[PDB]
RNA sequence: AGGGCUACACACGUGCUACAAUGGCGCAUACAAAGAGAAGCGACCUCGCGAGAGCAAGCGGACCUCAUAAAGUGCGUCGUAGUCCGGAUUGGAGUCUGCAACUCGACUCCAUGAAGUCGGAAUCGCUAGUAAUCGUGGAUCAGAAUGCCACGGUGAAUACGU
């Protein structure tokens, strides 16, 4: 994609330059992004999850295998064991491709969000934006009318802190939190 | 990558510099600050008393009663 | 019976004179067409609290013989049963049996 | 010759006629009809398609039926999620213009519920 | 359909009690029974005990709420839900 | 001062208006009676999209107004599909009486648009200006009429038999 020659070209000096680290590679970049998607419910009946595919679709077109729980004694709801997520991973060019319409299309499209607290980033500066919907980039039959199916957008990254991780988007200018 | 199975590309890897030429790259307030009503708040915007055409005739500064004229 | 509505109706009289003459043609000068881009004041039309028991809107009157609540006539200051008990005895002018 | 079809009525005088396009009652239709040429007393049959043009283009500048009612669905819902007795009302479909509750409620609150007597 | 008409309403009632209120930010509940009466500028920020007949119910006044009356948030009737009747003597 | 009977879950009583085409729709077209109007209505007036509006001479009602009486009349149009009948709901604007019009107020109007295809049990008035059906006015009356009360349009089956 477009992106990533234009990531390394400009982001990654002024990172480099605004952290005053060592090595060019001490800069954060984006590793693969999962998702999940964590649908719940629909054991026999897949509706739900054709409802949930079709989302998905919208950003990443791949097949969503549905998972299930490999136990099933946790915490959840169990009736027949449960399947709950997708994935929906975003990766290389797909991950490149990504990367720019969120923000710019994707903030546009979400009109009510509560998720992007500050002190919530850990480990890694590893994250999973909670948009509340789904974020439609254009696609050919998304709409078949539907409720809630936000997602986790399941970020992952070479970042090792919790500041090397909200590096990543700031070269798209987005109001986050201190 | 899984390349057949991704829908196009057309305006996705194109202009990763793009304006806010016709529409905003992030928004305000779509982190609700207060709940959106989808109403405008009247009387606070527009007007406690209506448009007044209809019955305009020159305005006459003093007192008359409906029963007081004969 | 109730005093209550004798009381009213005394009460009325002095003070449809004293809010009310003033006020006569007030909502129409001040709030109404006639105010087009002229008055339109709130400072000037939230005077109407002091007429508003002197209100045209208030003189539903009841009778005047006995203070007798519900189903009144302005024609005699009566109501049904009071109107036909003086009718009965002929103390109403002009007021006869009707047929046609 | 039906303007869009699916519903308009086949041949009917031009002013009844017209009142299933939607955004069109019988006063808007009556403008449309002088303005395209037509006279309101022909049926819709003695018509060719590009008269069917001419009217249809002075038909389509009004509001289409898929606004019209997410309009009046939005003017609901603002008030019904403030909880102003506007939207108290709406909730449950019960009158907000002063109409009564008494009697007659079959076609708004549905089927026959148990009275003691 | 109704409207307001064609005058100019701030309530003389709710007058003095703003004035007095609006001066320090925000005080205590302001009493009122004069719940005809809608809600303007003024009003923003303070809260109104608002009498419903029964008791006052306090309703805080912001910026979306200027378009309503004071009645309209504070309820009057009760709705019977219809489950099942009442049916017995109880001993 | 604010809330309430007219609440609402339904059942039950009554009347209106309807389910049709005897009609509705468009464009053109007609004649009333009787009365009411000093909280009231009101010429002329200017404003208004019809209605209306505010201003005001004025009124005593065979003068002026409510009031544009409606069904009915003319031509073309429509066939049981909730329609070409019925228009409730509801969104919005223009107008009104009042501190105040959200639940419990009025008038006009634009758009879309549900119940109802003459109702089992149940259920009444009627012998002819009657029953039926249409509009109008009025007592009450700030602002509310489907009610009630009187008036005028068009106006029926049969009364063998007990």
Do not use: H
């Given at each position: 994609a477009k992106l990533h020659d234009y990531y390394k070209d400009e982001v990654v000096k002024k990172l480099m330059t605004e952290f005053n680290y060592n090595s060019v590679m001490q800069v954060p970049r984006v590793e693969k992004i999962t998702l999940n998607?964590?649908?719940?419910?629909?054991?026999?009946?897949?509706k739900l999850l054709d409802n949930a595919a079709a989302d998905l679709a919208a950003i990443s077109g791949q097949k969503p295998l549905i998972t299930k729980a490999?136990?099933?004694?946790?915490?959840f709801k169990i009736r027949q064991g449960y399947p709950i997520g997708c994935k929906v991973t975003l990766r290389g060019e797909r991950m490149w491709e990504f990367f720019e319409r969120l923000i710019t299309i994707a903030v546009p499209r979400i009109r009510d969000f509560r998720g992007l607290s500050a002190k919530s980033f850990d480990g890694r500066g590893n994250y999973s934006m909670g948009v509340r919907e789904q974020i439609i980039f254009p696609e050919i039959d998304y709409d078949k009318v539907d409720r809630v199916r936000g997602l986790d957008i399941t970020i992952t990254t070479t970042a090792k802190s919790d500041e090397e991780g909200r590096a990543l988007l700031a070269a798209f200018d987005f109001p986050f939190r201190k | 990558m899984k390349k057949d199975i991704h829908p196009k590309y057309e305006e996705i890897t194109a202009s990763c510099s793009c304006g806010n030429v016709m529409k905003i790259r992030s928004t305000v307030g779509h982190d609700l600050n207060l709940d959106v009503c989808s109403k405008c708040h009247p009387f606070f915007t527009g007007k406690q008393r209506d448009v007044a055409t209809g019955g305009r005739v020159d305005r006459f500064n003093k007192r008359f009663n409906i029963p007081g004229s004969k | 019976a109730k005093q209550s509505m004798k009381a009213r109706e005394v009460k009325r009289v002095a003070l449809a004179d004293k809010y009310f003459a003033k006020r006569a043609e007030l909502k129409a000068i001040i709030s109404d067409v006639n105010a087009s881009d002229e008055d339109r004041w709130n400072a000037v039309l939230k005077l109407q609290t002091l007429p508003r028991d002197s209100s045209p809107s208030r003189q539903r009157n009841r009778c005047r013989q006995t203070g007798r609540p519900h189903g009144?006539?302005?024609?005699?200051?009566?109501?049904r049963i009071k109107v036909r008990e003086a009718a009965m005895r002929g103390?109403?002018?002009?007021?006869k049996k009707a047929s046609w | 010759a039906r303007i869009a079809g699916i519903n308009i009525p086949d041949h009917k005088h031009a002013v009844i006629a017209?009142?299933?396009?939607?955004?069109?009652?019988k006063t808007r239709s009556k403008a449309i009809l002088a303005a395209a040429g037509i006279a309101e007393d022909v049926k819709i049959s003695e018509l060719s398609e590009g008269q069917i043009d001419t009217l249809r283009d002075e038909v389509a500048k009004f509001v289409v039926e898929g606004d019209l009612r997410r309009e009046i669905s939005m003017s609901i819902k603002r008030l019904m999620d403030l909880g102003c007795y506007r939207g108290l009302r709406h909730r449950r479909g019960l009158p907000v213009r002063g109409q009564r509750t008494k009697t007659n409620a079959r076609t708004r609150k549905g089927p026959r519920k148990p009275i003691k007597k | 359909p109704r409207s307001l008409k064609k005058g100019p309403f701030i309530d003389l009632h709710l007058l003095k009690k703003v004035e007095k209120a609006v001066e320090s930010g925000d005080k205590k509940p302001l009493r009122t029974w004069s719940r005809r009466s809608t809600i303007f500028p003024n009003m923003i920020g303070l809260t109104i005990a608002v009498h419903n007949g029964r008791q006052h119910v306090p309703v805080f006044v912001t910026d979306e709420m200027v378009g309503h009356k004071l009645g309209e948030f504070a309820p009057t009737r009760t709705y019977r839900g219809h489950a099942a009747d009442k049916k017995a003597k109880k001993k």
């Open positions: 998607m964590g649908v719940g419910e629909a054991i026999a009946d897949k490999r136990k099933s004694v946790a915490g | - | 009144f006539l302005r024609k005699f200051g009566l109501s103390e109403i002018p002009g007021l | 017209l009142t299933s396009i939607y955004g069109v009652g | -």
